[PDB]
Design a protein around this ligand. Sequence first.
Ligand code: HEM
Ligand code: HEM
Ligand code: HEM
Ligand code: HEM
Ligand code: HEM
Ligand code: HEM
Ligand code: HEM
Ligand code: HEM
Ligand code: HEM
Ligand code: HEM
Ligand SMILES: [Ca+2]
Ligand SMILES: [Ca+2]
Ligand SMILES: [Ca+2]
Ligand SMILES: [Ca+2]
Ligand SMILES: [Ca+2]
Ligand SMILES: [Ca+2]
Ligand SMILES: [Ca+2]
Ligand SMILES: [Ca+2]
Ligand SMILES: [Ca+2]
Ligand SMILES: [Cl-]
Ligand SMILES: [Cl-]
Lengths: 140, 140, 140, 147, 147, 142, 142, 145, 145, 145
Amino acid sequence: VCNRLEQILVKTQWAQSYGEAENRAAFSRDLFSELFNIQGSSRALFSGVGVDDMNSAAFTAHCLRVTGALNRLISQLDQQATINADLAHLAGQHASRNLDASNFAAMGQAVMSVVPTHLDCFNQHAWGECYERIASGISG
Amino acid sequence: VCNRLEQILVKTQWAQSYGEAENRAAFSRDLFSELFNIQGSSRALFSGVGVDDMNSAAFTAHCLRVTGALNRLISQLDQQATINADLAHLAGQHASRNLDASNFAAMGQAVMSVVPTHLDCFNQHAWGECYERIASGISG
Amino acid sequence: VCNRLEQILVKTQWAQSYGEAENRAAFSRDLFSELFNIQGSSRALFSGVGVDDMNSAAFTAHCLRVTGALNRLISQLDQQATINADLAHLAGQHASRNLDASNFAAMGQAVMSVVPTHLDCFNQHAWGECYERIASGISG
Amino acid sequence: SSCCSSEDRANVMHNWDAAWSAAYSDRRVALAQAVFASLFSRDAAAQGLFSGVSADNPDSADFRAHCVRVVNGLDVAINMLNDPAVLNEQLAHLSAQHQARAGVAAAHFDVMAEAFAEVMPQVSSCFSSDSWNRCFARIANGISAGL
Amino acid sequence: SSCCSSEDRANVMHNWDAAWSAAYSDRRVALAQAVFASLFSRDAAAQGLFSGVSADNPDSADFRAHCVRVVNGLDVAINMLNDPAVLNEQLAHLSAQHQARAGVAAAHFDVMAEAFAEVMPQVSSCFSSDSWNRCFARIANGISAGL
Amino acid sequence: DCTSLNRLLVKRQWAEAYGEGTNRELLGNRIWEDLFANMPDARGLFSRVNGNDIDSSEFQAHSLRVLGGLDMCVASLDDVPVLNALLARLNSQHDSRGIPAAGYPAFVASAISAVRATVGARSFDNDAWNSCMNQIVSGISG
Amino acid sequence: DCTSLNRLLVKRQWAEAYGEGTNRELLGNRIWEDLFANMPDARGLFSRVNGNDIDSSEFQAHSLRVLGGLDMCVASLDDVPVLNALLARLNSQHDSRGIPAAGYPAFVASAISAVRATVGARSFDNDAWNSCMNQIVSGISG
Amino acid sequence: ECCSRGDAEVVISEWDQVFNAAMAGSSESAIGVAIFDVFFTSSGVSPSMFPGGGDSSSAEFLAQVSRVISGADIAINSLTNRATCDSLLSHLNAQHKAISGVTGAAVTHLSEAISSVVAQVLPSAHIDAWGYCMAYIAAGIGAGL
Amino acid sequence: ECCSRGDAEVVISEWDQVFNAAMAGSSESAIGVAIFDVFFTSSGVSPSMFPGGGDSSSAEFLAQVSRVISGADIAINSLTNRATCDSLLSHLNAQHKAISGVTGAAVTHLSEAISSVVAQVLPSAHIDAWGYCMAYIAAGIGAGL
Amino acid sequence: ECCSRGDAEVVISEWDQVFNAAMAGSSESAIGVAIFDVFFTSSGVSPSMFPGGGDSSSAEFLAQVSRVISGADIAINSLTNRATCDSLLSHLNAQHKAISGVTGAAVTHLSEAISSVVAQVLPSAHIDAWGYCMAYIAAGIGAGL
Ligand code: HEM
Ligand code: HEM
Ligand code: HEM
Ligand code: HEM
Ligand code: HEM
Ligand code: HEM
Ligand code: HEM
Ligand code: HEM
Ligand code: HEM
Ligand code: HEM
Ligand SMILES: [Ca+2]
Ligand SMILES: [Ca+2]
Ligand SMILES: [Ca+2]
Ligand SMILES: [Ca+2]
Ligand SMILES: [Ca+2]
Ligand SMILES: [Ca+2]
Ligand SMILES: [Ca+2]
Ligand SMILES: [Ca+2]
Ligand SMILES: [Ca+2]
Ligand SMILES: [Cl-]
Ligand SMILES: [Cl-]
């Protein structure tokens, strides 16, 4: 899942969206705003990172960690052993959170809702495949 | 000292300088920067208001109090009984500071150095007279 | 009076005001307009240079001679023997005019009213000192 | 024969540039590997022509270097599309090099074109297929002339 | 220790440039003369260190040339504030030169800083004292390192 | 030594100098104009590609092939096995042409000067460029 | 002869070429690039300041010290006693380094060309610059 | 101040120049391994305390390098919003407090290795701004260590 | 947040509209006396605790009114730089802590009198922004009272 | 015409280039002494008729040089307002009529020395515009002499 060519499209389109965003904090907050608007029940999962005020330093910091992690993962999609190790680390970090498939699905919808609004060109399928690669590695 | 006509020039020129300043904090800090540059010994008098860092909240707040006081005094130059009362209040506030004539002179030079650099027209004499009115009331 | 450092401030600020004035005639006329507005009695002293019409060629020429003289003097503040000789020449030229201290004082106020309105930075004390150096040399 | 217009050249150069990795060889190798995999699937006999570059192991350094050479050659040609006088010299150069390889034939260039047409939409955003097809023909026909 | 920020460097470079006489040595000599007069007033013993440049007669050509050297050295350092890699080499150079002068000590640089802080507001319009103090420290500390 | 950090700087600066197709010819011309000025006898080696008029179509295509070859090597500096296979082919393409050994250091000087002129002197690192260019020509020359 | 009028022209043109701090490095580089091209053996004299990479921090600081030294001399051209004291120190700083006598005329040519390139040829006066630069190096060289 | 808005902008710009469109996504591993090499030499910290034992041929260490460069990236890019940056640093501080053998001095050494490697790949780097802003980062990550 | 940057800008703009070029320097006394009248009615605080006993015919009270309107002016005009504003309010807090009979509730009443008088002379006033920003001011001046 | 508006603008620009921010206030004496040296050689006028006897080591002559360069500056800078310039020249004419031994030819020689020295320090100088405008100046100063 997420073949070598699909990785080219996703790396390029991430570069053109996240990579060119003038306000990285806003981009990252938008992702979570979209997540909560897609799946209202997901918001309570973030009670430990100041989610009651999405403009807080605490919540903004969480959002930046998440898009930073998306960035570092997308950068290593082509390095199987490295990304597998990094995904396993992230899976450990999410294990105690009692997430389910619907949570990962909603996040994928959030990613694929935000990214193309920063682009002139977007490839839905490649993004679905490579999001699946990441989500499967983090969910276990 | 500071006759009714001189007051018109000073009120008008203050309005055009302080009154139109887009950055009141900067205007006020500039006054004190000029004071310290005129009379280096004056700086130590402000040790209680964070003067070691002129860009501090504490020192900026002091500067704003001072130009606010200049503003309220200039607004009442024509109301003898009121300004006399207000000047007496200020004199009380400065009494414990052990200031001398040279300090008041340096402040006058500071005021008359900053104000005209914000103006197209400036009347040196009227400003000297009305600064004297204020300084004499505060020095006792 | 007018020490070597004060001369640096005055030379620099003159350069930035007179030296950068796009309309030297207007700058020079403004000086005399300010002089007459400060001391009305001074105007009659200029009856020989067409003062009834301050926009006349005759009066404008006088004003330009005066600011030209200020320029050449400020340029030599640091050359004691030369400026002393030049000041003595000017004193000779003013001797028959029966001027008094109040006239020189008013001119100083005029200079210090016009100059800073062309500047972002002005040093009142240095200008007072160096104006005094010039005035004392011309008055005798 | 459909002409590779000024507009087509702009489209191709844009797509090619936008997908280019300027400092690292990995992406251009991945692109070429996919092209060759398609070529060999379509024409099984063609693989033999590449015995001198270890086509039997497409992950080998030997084959990956060949991939770099081919993509570089195409990159140079694409970047010459707005200077066709220079392009002609480049294509004549490449033609001579292919004439020197026994068994390489004009028909192979048609299969190679099918391979790029399959692969480019998988690596290039907003890919202009018609402009690519016409301008790849311009380039390929220049190389295959004389064989 | 307060950092000499990008903003401070801009302020210092602006004040320094605005006061600079670019074609003649007179002004920079007057500036340095005032600095040395202040230094020697504050620390009477310091004057002995300058016996090799006729400090006993500050109006001498010998001492005036020293004044030119010191102000030039500071001018070069100030103009390097936006290129601190280069600044470090310059300050290391000046440090070596001062290490070679017997009796020159770190404490003298504190007195020199007091002297410039007294003199600069007398020669520079709209002088930014805090930025000067922080950036003079940046420069002086680089020279006084190792003594 | 062409170190890991050297390769990173050379890659980035090469991508700036070469990364946009227009003005590849400008980079190329800077190299040849310099090389032929310093080593006029080298011009004769390029007779087949019309080197007397470096602005000719034949020479311009040659120049752009050379830059493409450098690009392949720079892109592969982090992959020594692929780099070695690229250099092996370049070596085959340069042998038995009577190219003097001295031509290679001259080309390296010319190429480095050209890149420096294109990206600017203040960010340039001559040691990195010399080290990495020398690795490249060491594999070509012979 | 470096006449009074020559000194006035040289002062004004130097102030234009050097007067703004940014691009002092640009003036310096023009000098060294030219000098080392014409006199490659001179580069060796600067080994302690990393002259093989003129773009290095060590060499750039040296270059800026040199320009500062020229600035001191130009600023003092009208004050011969101060100029002589400046040149005396510069002489002390250049002796026993094995600097060839020929290095000085070469530097003068390089410096003049650099200033000319910076301020423009149409207002330039080569005689004035040569005369005044020669007064300067006459005091340094030895 | 120390790491002013202006200093932060320079640092962000320079980090962006290193990780520009050509280099971003491909050079992190090389930069990171170089940072670790300088850090091990200056700090004396054992590579064995790291995932994959600090072996650059190990995917576990390569993933650690990816994480460290990314954490640095996030902190650097937040330098102009101090409240957010403070929060990022506090999170990193908590993570390192949960790891035996992380000292304040070692955190300083790693931050200085970031600066020094940046200056090697970007010779024009503003070494002072990097020093001030990396010291702010080190103070936050190393708090109480 | 409460008294956001945007709220502060509205409040500053509206105070500037009241004290515009025509009115500034001439209307402070009338505005101030009106503010005190509303404050005395809402707070129940004795006028006798003020200079001149709260008598508008007394120069001592008129000078007090001048001071209060000026203090308000300084605080309002600093609302967009919260650190500076916090300092101004802390100074005012210290001054009122040194005065017997100043309560937090009374400080709130005076701040609301400022808002209410502004809305009377400027009917378009953004009463919500004034409420939020005057509450921030009152919280600072009235701290611990 | 002779010394047109355009000619005057060129002359003013070139005099401003000589006396630019770097040179103004420091170079007048050197320029002036050079002008006098050329003038004495071309005119045959005795230095003894001048203050300090034309000795550049004399402060009286240095002050005279300051005056002459300043008079030239004032006239030059007024070249685009002919009525004002005419008045300046008439004043200078009166001053020289009161001095024995000033001839029209000598006035011409001094004006040409100004032009020639300018061209020596500014090799790009528009020598024709300088000739026409200095001839206008000389005609005014030398009227009836
Ligand atoms: C598939 C893409 C995802 C990525 C790249 C990602 C990344 C991250 C990262 C980097 C952290 C911080 C780890 C740390 O430093 O402690 C984190 C924390 C967390 N993530 Fe995710 N995540 C993903 C998906 C999700 C989903 C689908 C949810 C839930 C709907 C989720 C819920 C959480 C929670 C609850 C935390 C902990 C917040 C806390 O510290 O209280 N994540 N994630
Ligand atoms: C003549 C015009 C002046 C005006 C309008 C003025 C105004 C003020 C004001 C409003 C305050 C704050 C009072 C408070 O709330 O406690 C103050 C404090 C002070 N003023 Fe002035 N002042 C003037 C002149 C001077 C001069 C000439 C100096 C000294 C050179 C000076 C030194 C001080 C000091 C030391 C304080 C106390 C700072 C602290 O709280 O530690 N003032 N002034
Ligand atoms: C202190 C600065 C002054 C400077 C630099 C200055 C300069 C001059 C100059 C250059 C002239 C023309 C001399 C000539 O060519 O004949 C002049 C004339 C004159 N000045 Fe001044 N002056 C100064 C102050 C004053 C003052 C204070 C007054 C009177 C308030 C005054 C009154 C006159 C008069 C009456 C003339 C003669 C006008 C005529 O020709 O009828 N000057 N001054
Ligand atoms: C537009 C399309 C093509 C381009 C740009 C291209 C480019 C290149 C380049 C640059 C080389 C290296 C030449 C050398 O170093 O001597 C090469 C080699 C070669 N090409 Fe192509 N080529 C293309 C199409 C084809 C096709 C369609 C075939 C046949 C199936 C083919 C077969 C070969 C062979 C057999 C070699 C030699 C490999 C070796 O080194 O052993 N090429 N090509
Ligand atoms: C930032 C401050 C300073 C700068 C930029 C500076 C710069 C210079 C320069 C450029 C020289 C000439 C070096 C040579 O030609 O060998 C020099 C010489 C010297 N400096 Fe400083 N200096 C500074 C502070 C000090 C201080 C604080 C002292 C001690 C009081 C000091 C003592 C000396 C001495 C004794 C010499 C040798 C004079 C001679 O030639 O005989 N300097 N300095
Ligand atoms: C890093 C250094 C160099 C690179 C990357 C390079 C690259 C190339 C390339 C790609 C070709 C075309 C090969 C082909 O397809 O047949 C070529 C041809 C050639 N190169 Fe180089 N080259 C380099 C240095 C030099 C030097 C130093 C010389 C001689 C002074 C030289 C002389 C030639 C000649 C004579 C040809 C053949 C021209 C022809 O086709 O007739 N090269 N080079
Ligand atoms: C007008 C001409 C020149 C000026 C103003 C000048 C100025 C300077 C200055 C200011 C220094 C630093 C002195 C110190 O602080 O130790 C220096 C060093 C040096 N100069 Fe010159 N210089 C000139 C010409 C030359 C020439 C023509 C050469 C040789 C071809 C040369 C070779 C050197 C060397 C080798 C050093 C020492 C580098 C080191 O520190 O290792 N200079 N020069
Ligand atoms: C500027 C300084 C530093 C930065 C930016 C930094 C950054 C990071 C980041 C982003 C992580 C990943 C956290 C996670 O997701 O679980 C991490 C983990 C870690 N860091 Fe650091 N670090 C720094 C200094 C240090 C130092 C000085 C040491 C050792 C003395 C150290 C040892 C570790 C270890 C052992 C881990 C955990 C590996 C694991 O258990 O997965 N770090 N660091
Ligand atoms: C928004 C609320 C308020 C503001 C902006 C304000 C402002 C001020 C200012 C600027 C001063 C002058 C301080 C000085 O220079 O010494 C002052 C003094 C004073 N205030 Fe307030 N005040 C507020 C609320 C109150 C309240 C609620 C009371 C009474 C319960 C009060 C009672 C006083 C008194 C008695 C003085 C001192 C008069 C004197 O001794 O000179 N204030 N206030
Ligand atoms: C372009 C031509 C000339 C210009 C611009 C010029 C300008 C001046 C000026 C501005 C003064 C000062 C007047 C004052 O303030 O009293 C002056 C004075 C004088 N000029 Fe000229 N002049 C010119 C030609 C000449 C010539 C040709 C001679 C001699 C033959 C001459 C001889 C003198 C003398 C002797 C004085 C009076 C010195 C004194 O008694 O203080 N001038 N001139
Ligand atoms: Ca959009
Ligand atoms: Ca102004
Ligand atoms: Ca103005
Ligand atoms: Ca690779
Ligand atoms: Ca001089
Ligand atoms: Ca051609
Ligand atoms: Ca061969
Ligand atoms: Ca460098
Ligand atoms: Ca020596
Ligand atoms: Cl890729
Ligand atoms: Cl000066």
